[PDB]
UniProtKB/Swiss-Prot annotation, chains A, B:
GO terms for molecular function: magnesium ion binding; protein homodimerization activity; RNA binding; thymidylate synthase activity. This is Thymidylate synthase. It catalyses: dUMP + (6R)-5,10-methylene-5,6,7,8-tetrahydrofolate = 7,8-dihydrofolate + dTMP. Its EC number is 2.1.1.45. DUMP binds at R21, R126, R127, R166, S167, C168, D169, N177, H207, L208, Y209. Keywords: Cytoplasm, Formylation, Methyltransferase, Nucleotide biosynthesis, Repressor, RNA-binding, Transferase, Translation regulation. GO terms for cellular component: cytosol.
Amino acid sequence: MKQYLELMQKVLDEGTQKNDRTGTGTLSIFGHQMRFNLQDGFPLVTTQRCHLRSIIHELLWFLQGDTNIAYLHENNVTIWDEWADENGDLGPVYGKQWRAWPTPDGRHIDQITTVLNQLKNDPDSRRIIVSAWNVGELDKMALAPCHAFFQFYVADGKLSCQLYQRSCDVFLGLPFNIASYALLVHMMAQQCDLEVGDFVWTGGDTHLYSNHMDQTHLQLSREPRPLPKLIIKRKPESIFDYRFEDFEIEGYDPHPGIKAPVAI
Amino acid sequence: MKQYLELMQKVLDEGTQKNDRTGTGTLSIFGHQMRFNLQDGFPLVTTQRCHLRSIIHELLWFLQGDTNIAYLHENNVTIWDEWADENGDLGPVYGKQWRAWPTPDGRHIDQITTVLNQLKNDPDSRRIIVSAWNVGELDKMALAPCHAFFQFYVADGKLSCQLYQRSCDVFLGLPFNIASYALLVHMMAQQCDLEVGDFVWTGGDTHLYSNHMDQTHLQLSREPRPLPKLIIKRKPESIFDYRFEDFEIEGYDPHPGIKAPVAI
Ligand SMILES: Cc1nc2ccc3ccc(CNc4ccc5c(c4)CN([C@@H](CCC(=O)O)C(=O)O)C5=O)cc3c2c(=O)[nH]1
Ligand SMILES: Cc1nc2ccc3ccc(CNc4ccc5c(c4)CN([C@@H](CCC(=O)O)C(=O)O)C5=O)cc3c2c(=O)[nH]1
Ligand SMILES: *[C@H]1C([N+](=O)[O-])C(=O)NC(=O)N1[C@H]1C[C@H](O)[C@@H](COP(=O)(O)O)O1
Ligand SMILES: *[C@H]1[C@@H]([N+](=O)[O-])C(=O)NC(=O)N1[C@H]1C[C@H](O)[C@@H](COP(=O)(O)O)O1
């Protein structure tokens, strides 16, 4: 995509050389924003094929409040195997915080339901947020949330969402996070009889791993193509009832994929 | 300041009327980003007078872990008055989450000292965060955190910071929040022997109240002036040991103030 490729070139031209956790080294920049008007089409990168099944399954997985890769397996999604433990468990990550943020007094708060109700009953609210950044349980998480905080906004029957990503594997992860939250907005908009609006993406440590230079240059030389369109062929009775078949996407004529190693 | 003034112009050009809870009506936009190179100067608005006195005191107050107006009062700062209960208690707001976010297993986390230990031993970390958005105790707070989430970054011996403000009263609160965090960056940096880099501001519902238009236009019709300079005259043994007096602001020649009624 236009913005996606500009953000990539930017890391190359401005990124600072940093030594990271994995000891691989990256080119980093701090703070950056991208806006995506959903009216123009789904933000699924075209300069590289991306499987919507991957994206669509992990998201449904979160909305389920599940933190065990079992399900993700029964559908060939593996990006979460490396971190899950012996029993395929990752701890109180994303799903757990979205669906059951544990209170100190021993209760649970369902941010999604709350958010659903706020959208339906009080769209002007400026407290329509949901964050996975639970300081009290980070140590228990197999890994700290990258996309850790997002907020919904409504104006003229349009539903927007701004995502704050503290850490961002520009080449590997970004394309997926974008599509995922873009897909969630659509779902929320459907269950709330709203029209989709803007998807604002904000990042903290935005980086490009040193051993991704080649794949990047390659991708940087490809011409982007019109964005596809997302079709949801059925409206479940809730936001926790969508399924893989429900979504469809036309107009996706991407360039072939580009293989790259993941940094552990 | 240019950034602040351009922001105000932006909300006026691309804003959209919205009805807030105080039923006052705002003109808002969603998502925005501005950077301030603390090296260029201290970001205290000049197109309108501000009192560093108050800013400092509220900040020292946060760093204390105090959520009771008594302190603020013993110092003539009264902005929080409106929201304090009969005992000057605001609930587990800012200061409390910073110094003692309560975990579910009876623990309490001091996000401030943590960040200080990280800026010292693992500055390359991508998870140097402080969150005030504690979903668990949100119902006990007098107000839901506006400046609710921030992140630090280090590069070339310079400390940077990015703040996510879910809600922003562009005319009233913004000026103070900016100067405040900028003030925190200089302090952190001093404790860690770093140099000040950039302060990046990112916002959610960035609005202007209806009763603030004539004033925002008056201010908007003013020429900015050179940013003042911040001078610390003592390096305390800890970030929690600063006193009002250690701070010295230089060359601040602002225009006259401008009164506008706060929205309850
Ligand atoms: C260093 C690093 N670490 C991570 C750790 C955990 C992650 C969890 C999720 C995501 C992003 N979301 C998805 C969601 C689905 C898939 C993958 C990623 C990528 N992927 C195939 C590639 C599919 C494609 O190219 O379409 C793979 O095995 O990489 C998936 O099935 C990224 C990371 C990163 C990441 O991007 N970088
Ligand atoms: C609608 C709305 N509500 C708020 C509620 C609580 C706030 C708490 C802090 C701040 C921002 N930080 C400071 C820090 C110091 C001062 C004030 C604000 C503004 N202020 C006025 C005096 C306000 C008063 O003391 O009554 C001044 O110009 O000195 C202060 O002393 C803003 C709000 C808002 C805000 O900006 N807007
Ligand atoms: C982390 C991530 N996740 O774990 O769920 C995701 O969805 N997208 C990412 O971009 N992402 C990446 C960023 C970074 O390179 C690493 C983790 O490193 P650290 O925790 O920030 O030190 O994963
Ligand atoms: C809230 C504030 N604070 O609580 O400390 C601050 O620092 N500055 C602000 O700009 N801010 C404003 C934004 C908005 O107009 C209200 C909060 O309203 P809700 O979003 O309904 O809670 O105060």
